[PDB]
Design a protein around this ligand. Structure first.
Ligand SMILES: NS(=O)(=O)c1ccc(C(=O)N2CCC(O)(c3ccccc3)CC2)cc1
Ligand SMILES: [Zn+2]
Length: 260
């Protein structure tokens, strides 16, 4: 992807992506608006299992689109299973999408409501051996999405907030060990699930989306720090990393299932 030029600006944003990635207008694109009244309870959905006790974080990277907290996924240490999933999915990284204002920022919406941000915990199906092979499969990834609203601070998020100063610009990375992703989860694991895609180019249709109903609360100071990051690289004109979210896409021939 050394020649990719997509972004979130007026000239390379979501409405332009289809030119280089035609799948942008595909049959199972994400995100989507979750109409809570139309989603149907599916009593066959097995309980969701989030096993992050042995998670091993390694580094945090500003990739020019968001920042990723990466994990060691060379072993089954932090896995997601159950719910609508068949098999074991290993945590590889998490990142967020956020806005320039508290009134926008999330990718998925709930009855058209936009949250201040959205956390994506990305996992890949171990039956495919590695992440690169998994994204070529319809059931290759499972992304656990969690909404963020502004209110009380999330103590478990502070370690991330404080390290952002070291990765202000595109390409910067910093050691980020011993971070516990369990501190970013809400109390309830009630969720909505549907078949979708990566929300950024290449927009591959390889994701089983599991979006939690309960948002976590973060403080204004915490999200404000996210907005101080840069899309640009060091020594380049400063462009604040804000509004790095793709808007809701057509649901088309899909049904959103609720676990509750
Ligand atoms: N917001 S999202 O849908 O949760 C998401 C998750 C991961 C990525 C990601 O890491 N990308 C996309 C896939 C990627 O382009 C790729 C493609 C093919 C092989 C290996 C990696 C690598 C970069 C992008 C978006
Ligand atoms: Zn994402």
């Amino acid at each position: 992807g050394m020649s990719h030029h997509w972004g979130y600006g007026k000239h390379n944003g979501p409405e332009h992506w289809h030119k280089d990635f035609p799948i942008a207008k595909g049959e199972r694109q994400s995100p989507v608006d979750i109409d809570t009244h139309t989603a149907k309870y599916d009593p066959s959905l097995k309980p969701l299992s989030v096993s992050y006790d042995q998670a091993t974080s390694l580094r945090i990277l500003n990739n020019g689109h968001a920042f990723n907290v990466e994990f060691d996924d060379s072993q089954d240490k932090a896995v997601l299973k159950g719910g609508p999933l068949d098999g074991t999915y290993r945590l590889i990284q998490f990142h967020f999408h956020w806005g320039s204002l508290d009134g926008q920022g999330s990718e998925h919406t709930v009855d058209k409501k936009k949250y201040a941000a959205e956390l994506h915990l990305v996992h890949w199906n171990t039956k495919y051996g590695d992440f690169g092979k998994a994204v070529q499969q319809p059931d290759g990834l499972a992304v656990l999405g969690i909404f963020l609203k502004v209110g009380s601070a999330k103590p478990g998020l502070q370690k991330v907030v404080d390290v952002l100063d070291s990765i202000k610009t595109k390409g910067k990375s910093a050691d980020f060990t011993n971070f516990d992703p369990r501190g970013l989860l809400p109390e309830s694991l009630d969720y909505w699930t549907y078949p979708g895609s990566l929300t950024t180019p290449p927009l591959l249709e390889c994701v089983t989306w599991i979006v939690l109903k309960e948002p976590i609360s973060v403080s204004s100071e915490q999200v404000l720090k996210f907005r101080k990051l840069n899309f640009n690289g060091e020594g380049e004109p400063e462009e604040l990393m804000v509004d790095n979210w793709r808007p809701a896409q057509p649901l088309k021939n899909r049904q959103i299932k609720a676990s509750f």
